[PDB]
RNA sequence: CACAUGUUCC
RNA sequence: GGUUCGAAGACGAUCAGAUACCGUCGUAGUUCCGACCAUAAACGAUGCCGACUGGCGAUGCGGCGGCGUUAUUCCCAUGACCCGCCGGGCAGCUUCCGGGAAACCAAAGUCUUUGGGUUCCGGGGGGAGUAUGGUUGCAAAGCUGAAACUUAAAGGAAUUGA
């Protein structure tokens, strides 16, 4: 990831970041997110640096690969946008998916049937999933978070600066991570592109599911 | 007894001692 | 202490001298009025003359009659 | 106003050490502070410092390591004999294995071990461990 | 910790924080044990060893836990030095 | 009778795979099983009850009274623990405090006073701990001095392995719950204070859960 | 103990403010301490607004409103239920109640 | 009050998720279906559970239910989750790019490309909500 | 518009 | 000089009684000038000077820079807005900095790891801010200020019932 031309920025990933609006930040700015931002455009939107996003995206990809057991990587999404992206990421990689309503006590209460013991916590949104960060303190848990400019850094341990508000920019970043964790371990060759198309990971609104069906009919 | 009126009672009592001591001199 | 000057010994000693008079034990042991009001006058024991025997009623809940002597 | 200069420098870098800053800036530069910083550096308590000598009282940037617990100052500078120098370090230093009391002597400014070697007393400056 | 005759005497040596250089306590349940995978230069694949770090729980609650790993990551060459 | 593990940290304890409880403290992993302590130090460990505190609350039909227990625990070499449990009945609270006391045992640091001959006996430096208004300080002491302290923290220093130490207590020490916890914090900070001997770069060994990540999946969940 | 950080008033740097009387009673209340209500209301609300309209000589005449700046004391406003007591965490909220009707 | 208690409700939840093909719509049939497949100690609870089942029936053909596990409705949701359209939502030949973000790519390596169209920035900063 | 007051122990 | 209000007082209600709360009057006073008086819950219940220790959005003044909308109109520059930066000015929000018995505190932190400087002030509760002495004041009263004796609690924060 450090000045290695195999892992530097790809042109195919540039057009994907811009079309999904991942470089578009929030209106406000958290003082820890002053190092991931190029400059604030007119209309008061900060611009997230995509190359530095890609560099932080690679460092978090080193985390899951270093975890020898793929099962105990807890991936949690609470907002309605992110359950569809995190479920197939856990299916493709081998991680543990949690889709909505994070029960308080899954990492602290032994009697619970959902008592999990991960080595890694991957968070779709720090504000939407602050509760998983609370039990990430009581148990020694390195934490990955998909942070926005507005997202605080309470008990996150590595952050990938992205747009976690837009639906297209949410599932694309997981489609980033689905490729890369399988690219250091041997599943995917880097010469040919990975065959799964990124609309599979994107959130489908119930209106959009209803919108789609008559064009198929 | 409020603390305000016991101070007022003291001043009425202190003034009474002022007149009583003054007539003897 | 509040003041920490290199030549504030007379300020520190005067403060400790004055604030000692506000202590109940120091003022009792260093005033003539406390020794004047003491019938013993610093004596551990003393001899007196019995003139009558007085019965003293007791205090709150524990109630009895205590036998005393006017010495 | 600013009565003591070393007291403000030592507490400024103690506040940074509690927060764990990598380096800290102190606003005045004095000969005593420069001598004070050289005492701690030979023992490896801090990272390497540098001064910015402008045409005023200069500014000192001191790189910090994580080896500092507390660097205090004793005011006023009480004179210390050789007889009660053990008494000073008994109630000020944490232990006899480590902890350094630095105090100015006629031979210069040095910690309490080197003052024992040269058999010279003087006025106390501060404590650090 | 040493004795006079040259033998280690403590029953264990505690860890140290990678960023703040403080020793991590035994009841610091918010401690981090990072594991950073290396990449082979030519094939771009996982090697097999670790580049592990250790951060105390105070840094996480103060919000520099991502920055602390990031600063060592430039120094250990994981992050591109231009960034 | 037989122990079945619940937390996956305790699974390696039953597989004869965790060599000591030191590397448990090395990685600051939480202990939530009282019998993990019983596997390593189940023989030399002893228990001693500090106080039975009959607290109560005012209800409409009288006062609801329950008994609060204070048990300090730990073998006389390297480890000491404290546990507080407030149950309905005295023996249940005493039994329930022992379980919580084993979960809260901490390693001690023993230092020398001046000269460094023999075995470490006293506190290596001046550490202190406090809760509420009770503040307790620990002072290094020469050999053969004994524990100069109040009787209740004296039992804790017997059970921590420290034979010589000078103490000083500031605050309302009649409250034994705060008086015992304030001392127990002070011993617990011995491995929280940085020592000039400890200035070397700590070599990182493999994580205990990492080293047997294949052993913890081939036989159970 | 201290109930309110601002002591139930907006006085922060003044130290002294002019008092104002109340609407129900004549209680002397400081201006920043008084519960101030400004009510925008018509002279007639539901029934009399209708029949006067056809009885008005001038067709399509808008009825003028009435503007009264109310000044209540602590005892008067609570007894008249202008404001009510809240929990210790609910006290710190100072946003107005939602306005839809 | 004809409010169903937790014992009646929880007994009716397990029946639906296990006997979807056996259950009907009208009250009297699934009353007798649940008679054989459930050990209900009294006739009163047998009518109450089957009656609450019938009220849950009207929720089933009108859409999904929160607290239920139906093998047929999850199959509808499973293929909808695995839907793949014929092109991606990322493949547009038209990408509108802010000029301030055009300075971003030019200082990077990937500055000038084929299908990047720079727009015109809005003049006059007006983005904050009015105070109050 | 008024609702003033009711010794001590668990 | 006294409009209004209004200690005292008068009268009418209420009540067992009102010498109170309610209502009608109403002296002193409340209004202006010249002199005393120096006491307030005179509060941020938080002495004054100096340094350090997170951010966040506001607001007052002054200064600096900048697309742009809008007036003199004939635009530069000045006004009114918008976007930032600087110094302190009153504040607010926020969090495991840290502290405190807690309430809570950017100070009430940088304290048993105790020392930047300098004043005032407290030693369980009453007696008592009392007596006496001194001093000021036309007076009211202001400042300083006990002891004899009595007492095992008084008190502060917080929890649960009533
Ligand atoms: Zn009023």
TrEMBL record, chain A:
Protein localization: Cytoplasm
Sorted keywords for this record are: Cytoplasm, Ribonucleoprotein, Ribosomal protein
Q: Name one GO cellular component term.
A: cytosolic small ribosomal subunit
* One function term, GO molecular function aspect: structural constituent of ribosome
> A GO BP term, please?
translation
Q: How does it assemble?
A: Monomer (37LRP) and homodimer (67LR). Component of the small ribosomal subunit. Mature ribosomes consist of a small (40S) and a large (60S) subunit. The 40S subunit contains about 33 different proteins and 1 molecule of RNA (18S). The 60S subunit contains about 49 different proteins and 3 molecules of RNA (28S, 5.8S and 5S). Interacts with RPS21. Interacts with several laminins including at least LAMB1. Interacts with MDK. The mature dimeric form interacts with PPP1R16B (via its fourth ankyrin repeat). Interacts with PPP1CA only in the presence of PPP1R16B.
Family the UniProt entry places it in: Belongs to the universal ribosomal protein uS2 family.
Annotated protein name in UniProt: 40S ribosomal protein SA
**Organism ancestry:** Eukaryota, Metazoa, Chordata, Craniata, Vertebrata
Q: Which residues of the full protein are shown?
A: 2 to 218 of 282
